């Protein structure tokens, strides 16, 4: 088996990407945020509070025939920003892209947070992180990828996110048309259950390359590039007028400035994130201050390669016994 699904950004500064997913019988197609930095398949449903659904498409589990309660079974997740969701759990059929997966645990939200309700292009989340992270109780479930993994051609899934355009999520195979050159795979540490790897340095614009090791996760779930303070600051001193602001809570630069490119290490390889991707547009509407896409990891305790650096490469998530992360240039 295999399956390619089109992910299309929800915004004009690409700050999230939704991929359509079919749940039930017959099919209910909800648009889901594919998060490799969580491990929960949750959705906006019919059991979700009515003051808590704005304009989202809902998954009505009493009109899927493959749909059954997992009783006493209960979920509760919290994200890196505040972000909250929770309820009960169903078992049902999920296709992504044609790849069918049967009795997958679909967690059906009874409470969602304010910031999920504000968010009307996203109907729920699909976790593509490691399964020790799954939050269901008292019996822990697995992710799509882990429920499909055995039935797939190669146990792997690619991220190919576009800059201002849609992209693709492929399950089961490497599309060798989708990239330039070689893919460099590097070693992954699965111990905290993240797509966690080790970056071999950085370059800022045309400058010289720094051999330091940056431990990060691959998280398609995060918009921006969260790197340690020394690295991020070496960055922003190349852009004239950029400061750190304690009421925007991060690095801004005026909009008329030319953003130079960020280079990160993949083994002996180099993936250049062009100047253009790091500009997240003006802070408020009207403003001539613009939000930067390289921000400090200091206040979250972990470094994230988010959508800014991932949407610069073709990404292979090798879900083999000894998992690796592969980046190519595109």
């Amino acid at each position: 088996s295999t399956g390619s699904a089109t992910t299309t950004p929800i915004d004009s500064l690409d700050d999230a990407y939704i991929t359509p997913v079919q749940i039930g019988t017959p099919a209910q197609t909800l648009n889901l945020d594919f998060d490799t930095g969580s491990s929960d398949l949750w959705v906006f449903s019919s059991e979700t509070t009515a003051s808590e659904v704005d304009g989202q498409t809902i998954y009505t589990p009493s009109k899927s025939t493959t749909a059954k309660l997992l009783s006493g079974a209960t979920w509760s997740i919290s994200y890196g920003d505040g972000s909250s969701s929770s309820g009960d759990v169903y078992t049902d059929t999920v296709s992504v892209g044609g790849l069918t997966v049967t009795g997958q645990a679909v967690e059906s939200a009874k409470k969602v947070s304010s910031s999920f309700t504000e968010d009307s292009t996203i109907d729920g989340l699909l976790g593509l992180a490691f399964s020790t992270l799954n939050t269901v109780s008292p019996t822990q479930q697995k992710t799509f990828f882990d429920n499909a993994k055995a039935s797939l051609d190669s146990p792997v899934f690619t991220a190919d996110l576009g800059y201002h355009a849609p992209g693709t999520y492929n399950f089961g195979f490497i599309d060798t048309t989708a990239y330039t050159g070689s893919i460099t795979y590097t070693a992954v540490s699965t111990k905290q259950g993240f797509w966690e790897w080790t970056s071999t340095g950085y370059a800022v614009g045309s400058g010289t390359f720094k051999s330091t090791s940056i431990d990060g996760i691959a998280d398609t779930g995060t918009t921006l590039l969260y790197l340690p303070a020394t690295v991020v600051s070496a960055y922003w001193a190349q852009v004239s007028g950029a400061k750190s602001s304690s009421s925007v809570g991060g690095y801004v630069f005026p909009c008329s400035a030319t953003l130079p490119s960020f280079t990160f290490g993949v083994g002996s390889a180099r993936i250049v994130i062009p100047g253009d991707y790091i500009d997240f547009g003006p802070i408020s509407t009207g403003s001539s201050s613009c939000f930067g896409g390289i921000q400090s990891s200091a206040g979250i305790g972990i470094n994230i390669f988010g959508d800014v650096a991932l949407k610069a490469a073709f990404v292979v998530f090798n879900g083999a016994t000894t998992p690796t992360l592969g980046f190519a240039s595109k």
Partner: peptide, 8 residues
């Protein structure tokens, strides 16, 4: 902008 920080 409305960035995303997808677990805790």
């Amino acid at each position: 902008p409305h960035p995303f920080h997808x677990i805790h």
